[PDB]
Short mmCIF file of C-alpha atoms and ligand atoms in Angstrom, two decimals:
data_model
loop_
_atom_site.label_atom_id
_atom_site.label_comp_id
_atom_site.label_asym_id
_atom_site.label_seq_id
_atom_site.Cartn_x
_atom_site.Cartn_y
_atom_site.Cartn_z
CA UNK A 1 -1.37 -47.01 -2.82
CA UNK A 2 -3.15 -43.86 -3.53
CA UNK A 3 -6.66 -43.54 -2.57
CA UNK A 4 -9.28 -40.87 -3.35
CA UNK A 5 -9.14 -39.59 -0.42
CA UNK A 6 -5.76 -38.79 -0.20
CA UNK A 7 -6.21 -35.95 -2.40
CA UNK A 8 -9.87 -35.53 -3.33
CA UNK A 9 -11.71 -33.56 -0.92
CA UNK A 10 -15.64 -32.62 -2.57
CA UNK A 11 -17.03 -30.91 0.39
CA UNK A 12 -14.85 -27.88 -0.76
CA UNK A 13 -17.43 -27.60 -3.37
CA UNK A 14 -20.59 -28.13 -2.20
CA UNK A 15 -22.80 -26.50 -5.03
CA UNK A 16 -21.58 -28.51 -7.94
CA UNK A 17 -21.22 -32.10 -8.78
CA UNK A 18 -18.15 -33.98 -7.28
CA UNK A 19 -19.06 -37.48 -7.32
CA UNK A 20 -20.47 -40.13 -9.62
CA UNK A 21 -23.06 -42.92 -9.21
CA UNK A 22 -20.21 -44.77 -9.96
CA UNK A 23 -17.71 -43.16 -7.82
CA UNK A 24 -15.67 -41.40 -9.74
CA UNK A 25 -14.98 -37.77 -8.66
CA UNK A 26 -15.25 -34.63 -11.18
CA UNK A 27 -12.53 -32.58 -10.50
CA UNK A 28 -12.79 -28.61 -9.63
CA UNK A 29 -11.10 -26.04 -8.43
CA UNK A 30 -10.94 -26.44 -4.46
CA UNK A 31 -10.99 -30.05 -4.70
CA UNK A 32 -7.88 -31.43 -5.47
CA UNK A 33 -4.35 -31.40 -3.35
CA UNK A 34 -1.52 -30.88 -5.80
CA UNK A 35 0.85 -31.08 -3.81
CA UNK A 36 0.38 -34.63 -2.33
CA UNK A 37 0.17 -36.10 -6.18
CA UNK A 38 2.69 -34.70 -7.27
CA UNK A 39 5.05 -35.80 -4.59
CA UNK A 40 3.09 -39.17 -5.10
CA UNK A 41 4.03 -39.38 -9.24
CA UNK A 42 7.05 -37.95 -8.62
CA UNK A 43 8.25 -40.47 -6.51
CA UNK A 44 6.84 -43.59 -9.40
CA UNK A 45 8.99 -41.22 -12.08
CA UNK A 46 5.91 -41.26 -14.64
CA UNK A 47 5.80 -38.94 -17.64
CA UNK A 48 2.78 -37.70 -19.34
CA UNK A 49 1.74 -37.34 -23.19
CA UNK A 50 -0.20 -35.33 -24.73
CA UNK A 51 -1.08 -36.02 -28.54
CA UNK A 52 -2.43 -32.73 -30.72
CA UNK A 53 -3.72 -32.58 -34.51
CA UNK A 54 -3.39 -29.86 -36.66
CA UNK A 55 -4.33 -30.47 -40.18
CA UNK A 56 -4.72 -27.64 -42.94
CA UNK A 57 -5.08 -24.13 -41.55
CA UNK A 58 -5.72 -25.26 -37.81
CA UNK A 59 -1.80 -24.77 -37.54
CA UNK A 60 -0.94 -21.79 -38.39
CA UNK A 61 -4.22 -20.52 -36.37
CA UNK A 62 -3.50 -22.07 -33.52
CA UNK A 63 -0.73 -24.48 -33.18
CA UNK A 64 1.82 -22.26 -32.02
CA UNK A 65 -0.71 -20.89 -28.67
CA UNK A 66 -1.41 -24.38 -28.35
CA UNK A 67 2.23 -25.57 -27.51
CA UNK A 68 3.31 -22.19 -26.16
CA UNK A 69 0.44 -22.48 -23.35
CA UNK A 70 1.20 -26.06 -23.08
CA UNK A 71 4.63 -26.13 -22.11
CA UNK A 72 3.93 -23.61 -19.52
CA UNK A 73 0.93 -25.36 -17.77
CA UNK A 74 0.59 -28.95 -18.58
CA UNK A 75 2.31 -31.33 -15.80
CA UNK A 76 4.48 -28.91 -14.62
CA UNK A 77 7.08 -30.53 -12.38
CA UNK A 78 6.92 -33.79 -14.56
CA UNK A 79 8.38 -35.47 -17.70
CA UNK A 80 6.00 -34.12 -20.30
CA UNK A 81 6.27 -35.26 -24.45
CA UNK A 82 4.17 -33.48 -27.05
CA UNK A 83 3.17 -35.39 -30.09
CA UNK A 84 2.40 -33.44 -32.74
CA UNK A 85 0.62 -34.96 -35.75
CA UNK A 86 0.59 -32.25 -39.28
CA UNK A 87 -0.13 -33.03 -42.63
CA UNK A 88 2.62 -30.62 -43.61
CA UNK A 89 6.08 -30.73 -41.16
CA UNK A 90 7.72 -27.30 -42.86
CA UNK A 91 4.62 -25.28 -41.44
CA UNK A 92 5.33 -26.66 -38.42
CA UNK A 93 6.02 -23.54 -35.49
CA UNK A 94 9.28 -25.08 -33.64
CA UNK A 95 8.82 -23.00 -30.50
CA UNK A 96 11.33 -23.02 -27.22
CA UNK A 97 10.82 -25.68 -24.58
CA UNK A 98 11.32 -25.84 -21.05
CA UNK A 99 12.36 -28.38 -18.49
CA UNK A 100 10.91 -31.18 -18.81
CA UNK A 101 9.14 -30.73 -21.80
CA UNK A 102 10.24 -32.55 -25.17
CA UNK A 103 8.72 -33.76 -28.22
CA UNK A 104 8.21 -35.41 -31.81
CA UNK A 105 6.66 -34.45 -34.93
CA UNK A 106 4.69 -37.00 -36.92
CA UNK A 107 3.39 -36.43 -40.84
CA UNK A 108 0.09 -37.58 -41.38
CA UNK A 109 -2.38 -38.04 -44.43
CA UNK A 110 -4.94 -34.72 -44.69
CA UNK A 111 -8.41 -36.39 -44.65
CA UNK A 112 -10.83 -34.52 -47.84
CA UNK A 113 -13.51 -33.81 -45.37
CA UNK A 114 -12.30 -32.30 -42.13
CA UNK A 115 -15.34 -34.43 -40.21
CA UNK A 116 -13.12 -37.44 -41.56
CA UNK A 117 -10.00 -35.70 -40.56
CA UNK A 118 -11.45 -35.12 -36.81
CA UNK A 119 -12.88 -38.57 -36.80
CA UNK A 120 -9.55 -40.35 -38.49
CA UNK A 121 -7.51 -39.22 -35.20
CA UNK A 122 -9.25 -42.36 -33.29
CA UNK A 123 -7.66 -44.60 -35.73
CA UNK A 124 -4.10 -42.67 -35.73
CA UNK A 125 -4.04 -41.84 -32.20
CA UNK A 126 -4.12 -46.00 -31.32
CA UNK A 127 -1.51 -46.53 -34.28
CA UNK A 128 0.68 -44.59 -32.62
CA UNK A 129 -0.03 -45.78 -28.59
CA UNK A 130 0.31 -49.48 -29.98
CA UNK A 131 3.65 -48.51 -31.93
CA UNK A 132 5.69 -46.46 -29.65
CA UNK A 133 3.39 -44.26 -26.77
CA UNK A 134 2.33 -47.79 -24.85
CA UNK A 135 6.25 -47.59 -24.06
CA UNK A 136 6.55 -43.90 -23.70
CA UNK A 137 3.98 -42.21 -20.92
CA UNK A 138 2.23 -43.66 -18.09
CA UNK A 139 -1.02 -41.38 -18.86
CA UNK A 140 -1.73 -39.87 -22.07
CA UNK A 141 -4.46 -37.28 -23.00
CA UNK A 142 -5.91 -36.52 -26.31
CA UNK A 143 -6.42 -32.43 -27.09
CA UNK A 144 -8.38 -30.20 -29.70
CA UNK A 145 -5.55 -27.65 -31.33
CA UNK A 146 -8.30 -25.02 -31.19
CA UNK A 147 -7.60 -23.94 -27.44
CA UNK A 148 -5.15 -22.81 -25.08
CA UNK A 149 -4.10 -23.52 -21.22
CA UNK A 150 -4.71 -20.54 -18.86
CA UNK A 151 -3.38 -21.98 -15.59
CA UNK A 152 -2.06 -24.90 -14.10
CA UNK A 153 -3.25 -28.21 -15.48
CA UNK A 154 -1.70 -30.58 -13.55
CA UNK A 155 -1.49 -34.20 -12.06
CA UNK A 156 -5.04 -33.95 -10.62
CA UNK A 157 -6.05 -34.40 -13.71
CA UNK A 158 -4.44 -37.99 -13.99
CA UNK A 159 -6.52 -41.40 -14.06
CA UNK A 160 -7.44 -44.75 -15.95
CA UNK A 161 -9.64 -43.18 -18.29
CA UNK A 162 -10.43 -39.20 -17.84
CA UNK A 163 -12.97 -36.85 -19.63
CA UNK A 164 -13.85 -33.75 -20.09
CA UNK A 165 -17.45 -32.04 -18.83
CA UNK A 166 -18.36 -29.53 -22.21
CA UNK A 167 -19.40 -26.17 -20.92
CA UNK A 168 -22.27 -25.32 -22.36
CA UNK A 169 -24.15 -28.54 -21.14
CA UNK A 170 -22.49 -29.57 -17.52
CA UNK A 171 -25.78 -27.96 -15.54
CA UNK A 172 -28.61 -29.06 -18.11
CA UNK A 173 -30.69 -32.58 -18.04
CA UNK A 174 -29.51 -35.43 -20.25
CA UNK A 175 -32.59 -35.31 -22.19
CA UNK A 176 -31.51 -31.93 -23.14
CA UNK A 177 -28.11 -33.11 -23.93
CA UNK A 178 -26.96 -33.34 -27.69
CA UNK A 179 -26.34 -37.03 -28.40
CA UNK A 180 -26.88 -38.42 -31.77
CA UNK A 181 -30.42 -39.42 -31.56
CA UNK A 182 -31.04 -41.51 -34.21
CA UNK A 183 -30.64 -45.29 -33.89
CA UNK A 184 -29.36 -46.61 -37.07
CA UNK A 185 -26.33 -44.67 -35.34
CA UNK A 186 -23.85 -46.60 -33.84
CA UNK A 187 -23.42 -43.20 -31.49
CA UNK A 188 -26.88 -43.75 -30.39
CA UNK A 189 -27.56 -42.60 -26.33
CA UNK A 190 -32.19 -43.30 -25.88
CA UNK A 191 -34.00 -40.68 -24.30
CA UNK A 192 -33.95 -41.35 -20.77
CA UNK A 193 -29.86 -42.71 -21.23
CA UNK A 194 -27.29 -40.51 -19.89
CA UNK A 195 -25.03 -39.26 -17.41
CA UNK A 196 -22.90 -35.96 -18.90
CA UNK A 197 -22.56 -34.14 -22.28
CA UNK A 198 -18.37 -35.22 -22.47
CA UNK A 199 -16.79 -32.46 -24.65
CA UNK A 200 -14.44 -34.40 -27.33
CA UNK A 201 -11.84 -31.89 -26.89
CA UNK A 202 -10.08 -33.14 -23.89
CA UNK A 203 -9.75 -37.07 -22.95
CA UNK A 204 -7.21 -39.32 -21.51
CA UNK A 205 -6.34 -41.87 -19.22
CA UNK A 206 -3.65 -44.83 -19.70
CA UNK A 207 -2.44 -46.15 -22.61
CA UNK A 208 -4.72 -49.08 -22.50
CA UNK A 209 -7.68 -47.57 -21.81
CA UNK A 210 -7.33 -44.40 -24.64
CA UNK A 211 -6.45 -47.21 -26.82
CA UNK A 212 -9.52 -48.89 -26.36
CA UNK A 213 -11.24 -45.39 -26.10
CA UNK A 214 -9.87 -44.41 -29.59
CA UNK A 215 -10.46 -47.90 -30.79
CA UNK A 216 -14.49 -48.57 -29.94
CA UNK A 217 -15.06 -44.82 -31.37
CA UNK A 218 -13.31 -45.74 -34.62
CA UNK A 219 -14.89 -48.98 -35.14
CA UNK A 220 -18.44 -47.26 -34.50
CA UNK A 221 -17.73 -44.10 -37.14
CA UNK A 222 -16.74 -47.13 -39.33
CA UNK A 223 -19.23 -48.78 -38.44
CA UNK A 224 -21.54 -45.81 -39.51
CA UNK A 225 -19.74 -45.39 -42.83
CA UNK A 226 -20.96 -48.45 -44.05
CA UNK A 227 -24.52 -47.76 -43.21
CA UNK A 228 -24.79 -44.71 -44.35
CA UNK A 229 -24.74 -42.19 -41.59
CA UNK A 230 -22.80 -40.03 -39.69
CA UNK A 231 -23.29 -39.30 -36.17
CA UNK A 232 -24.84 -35.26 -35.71
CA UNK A 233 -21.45 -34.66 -33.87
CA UNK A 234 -18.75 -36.81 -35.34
CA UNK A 235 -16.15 -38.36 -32.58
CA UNK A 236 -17.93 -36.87 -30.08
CA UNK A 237 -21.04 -38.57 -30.67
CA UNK A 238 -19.31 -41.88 -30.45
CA UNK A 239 -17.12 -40.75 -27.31
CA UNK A 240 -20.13 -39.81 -25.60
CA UNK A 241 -21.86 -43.65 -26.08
CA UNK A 242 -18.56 -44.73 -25.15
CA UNK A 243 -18.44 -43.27 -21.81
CA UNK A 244 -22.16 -44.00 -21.62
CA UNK A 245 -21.09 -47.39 -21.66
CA UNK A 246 -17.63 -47.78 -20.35
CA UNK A 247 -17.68 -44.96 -17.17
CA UNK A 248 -14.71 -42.24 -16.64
CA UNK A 249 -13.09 -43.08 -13.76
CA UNK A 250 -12.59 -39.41 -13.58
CA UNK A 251 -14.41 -36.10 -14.39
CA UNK A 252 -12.95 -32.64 -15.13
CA UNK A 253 -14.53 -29.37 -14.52
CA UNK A 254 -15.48 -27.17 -17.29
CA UNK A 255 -12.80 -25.31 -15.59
CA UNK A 256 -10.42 -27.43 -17.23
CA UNK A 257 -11.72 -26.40 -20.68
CA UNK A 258 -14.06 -23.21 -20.47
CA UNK A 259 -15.99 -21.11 -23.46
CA UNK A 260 -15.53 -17.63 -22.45
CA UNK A 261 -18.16 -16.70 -25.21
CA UNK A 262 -20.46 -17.58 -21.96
CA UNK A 263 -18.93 -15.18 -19.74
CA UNK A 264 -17.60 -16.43 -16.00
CA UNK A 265 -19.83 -17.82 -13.85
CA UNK A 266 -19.43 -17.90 -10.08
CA UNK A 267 -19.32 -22.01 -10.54
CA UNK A 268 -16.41 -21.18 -13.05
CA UNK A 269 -13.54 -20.50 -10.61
CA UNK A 270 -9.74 -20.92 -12.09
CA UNK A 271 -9.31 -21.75 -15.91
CA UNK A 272 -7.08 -23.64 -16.39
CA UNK A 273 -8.06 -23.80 -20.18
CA UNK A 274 -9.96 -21.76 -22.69
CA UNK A 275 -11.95 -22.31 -26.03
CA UNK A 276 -10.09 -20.30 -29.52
CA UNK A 277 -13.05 -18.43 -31.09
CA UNK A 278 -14.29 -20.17 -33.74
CA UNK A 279 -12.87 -19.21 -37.48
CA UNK A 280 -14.59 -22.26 -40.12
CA UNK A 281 -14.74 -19.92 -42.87
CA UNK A 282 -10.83 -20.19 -43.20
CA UNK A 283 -9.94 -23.16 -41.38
CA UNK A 284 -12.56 -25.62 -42.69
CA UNK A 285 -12.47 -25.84 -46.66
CA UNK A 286 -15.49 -28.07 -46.59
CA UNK A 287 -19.30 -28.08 -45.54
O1 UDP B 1 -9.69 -29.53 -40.81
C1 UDP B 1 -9.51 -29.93 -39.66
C2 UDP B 1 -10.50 -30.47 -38.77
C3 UDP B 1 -10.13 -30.87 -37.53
N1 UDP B 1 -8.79 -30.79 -37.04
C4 UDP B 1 -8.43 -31.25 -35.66
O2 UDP B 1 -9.55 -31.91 -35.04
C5 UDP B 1 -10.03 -31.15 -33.88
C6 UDP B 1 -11.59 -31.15 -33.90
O3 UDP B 1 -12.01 -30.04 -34.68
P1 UDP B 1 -12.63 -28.64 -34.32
O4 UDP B 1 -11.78 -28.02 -33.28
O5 UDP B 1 -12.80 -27.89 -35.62
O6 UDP B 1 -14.01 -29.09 -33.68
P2 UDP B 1 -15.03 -28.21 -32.83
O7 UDP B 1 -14.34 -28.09 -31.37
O8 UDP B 1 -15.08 -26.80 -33.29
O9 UDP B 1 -16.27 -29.04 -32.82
C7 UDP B 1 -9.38 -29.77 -34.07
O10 UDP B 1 -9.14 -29.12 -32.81
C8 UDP B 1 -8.03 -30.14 -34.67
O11 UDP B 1 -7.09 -30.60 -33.72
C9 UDP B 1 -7.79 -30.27 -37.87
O12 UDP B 1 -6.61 -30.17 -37.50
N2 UDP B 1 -8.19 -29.86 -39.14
MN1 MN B 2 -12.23 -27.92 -31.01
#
């Protein structure tokens, strides 16, 4: 029923990149029509999920902003469930939600190496789509605990399978981009290969489709594991020959998940979410 169209509009944005070779639009600030999509999912009655980790330290840095800045932001105007995977439930912050916002708590095993414990959510985050959020949401998206949401992050953001543009790379060529390189890599992206540097910190889509997002990545870090290698940048080294491979029907902004470190440039304008300084030295206990 809906059609691109309808709510897509890229000639507000002229000077950056709106559409695909393949058609799919990348979403920024100007483009989109709220309004009509919202009216349009409100009317279907769909509900959204968002799944978060926060293993070791990660919670009590930023698990709390995380869900405070969520509720606020994400889907407003919709059904909304957080699922929040911990190793360890009693440090988990049990903050106040608002309408339509609910959620569930889920204990998981702490991987030894925390590039095993970002890679592991592939596997975990299918587990739990093929046990109970299949039946749950109509779109689901996959977040980093190590940011927060600045504005409105809302139903323009919705599609069959959605990623994220990383901020530091969205301008540059994709022989400049950092894909694992190597071959004996199941991550592997040639020289010459390439359409955008996808930041592993945001990703969704439909059930299905992050299933069989979470899925492929797993089965190539697996894949890896058994010859020896890991890719330069874990899961998103895999997620990035995923979408090489299988194409995002939709692109968001760096707007929708911005590094401040690099200031605010005039392409950059509404955040709607923002990078947590880095801290490794306390919330890594590893390499
Ligand atoms: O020890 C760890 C390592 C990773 N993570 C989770 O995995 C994501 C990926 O890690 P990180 O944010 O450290 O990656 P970076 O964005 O800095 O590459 C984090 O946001 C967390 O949600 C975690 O909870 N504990
Ligand atoms: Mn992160």
């Amino acid at each position: 029923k809906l059609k691109l169209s309808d709510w897509f509009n890229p000639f507000k944005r002229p000077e950056v990149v709106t559409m695909t070779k393949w058609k799919a639009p990348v979403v920024w600030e100007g483009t989109y029509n709220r309004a009509v999509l919202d009216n349009y999912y409100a009317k279907q009655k769909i509900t959204v999920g968002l799944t978060v980790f926060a293993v070791g330290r990660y919670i009590e840095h930023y698990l709390e902003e995380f869900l405070t800045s969520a509720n606020k932001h994400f889907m407003v105007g919709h059904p909304v469930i957080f699922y929040i995977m911990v190793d360890d439930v009693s440090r988990m912050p049990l903050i106040e939600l608002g309408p339509l916002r609910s959620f569930k708590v889920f204990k998981i095993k702490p991987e030894k190496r925390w590039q095993d414990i970002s890679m592991m959510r592939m596997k975990t985050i299918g587990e739990h789509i093929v046990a109970h959020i299949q039946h749950e949401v109509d779109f689901l998206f996959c977040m980093d605990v190590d940011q927060v949401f600045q504005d409105k992050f809302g139903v323009e953001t919705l599609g069959e399978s959605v990623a994220q543009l990383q901020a530091w790379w969205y301008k540059a060529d994709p022989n400049d981009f950092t894909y694992e390189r190597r071959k004996e890599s199941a991550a592997y992206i040639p020289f010459g290969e390439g359409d955008f540097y996808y930041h592993a910190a945001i990703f969704g889509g439909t059930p299905t489709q992050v299933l069989n997002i979470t899925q492929e990545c797993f089965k190539g870090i697996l894949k890896d594991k058994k010859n020896d290698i890991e890719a330069q940048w874990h899961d998103e080294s895999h997620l990035n020959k995923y979408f090489l491979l299988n194409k995002p029907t939709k692109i968001l902004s760096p707007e929708y998940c911005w590094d401040y470190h690099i200031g605010l440039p005039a392409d950059i304008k509404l955040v709607k979410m923002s990078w947590q300084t880095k801290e490794y030295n306390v919330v890594r206990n590893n390499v």
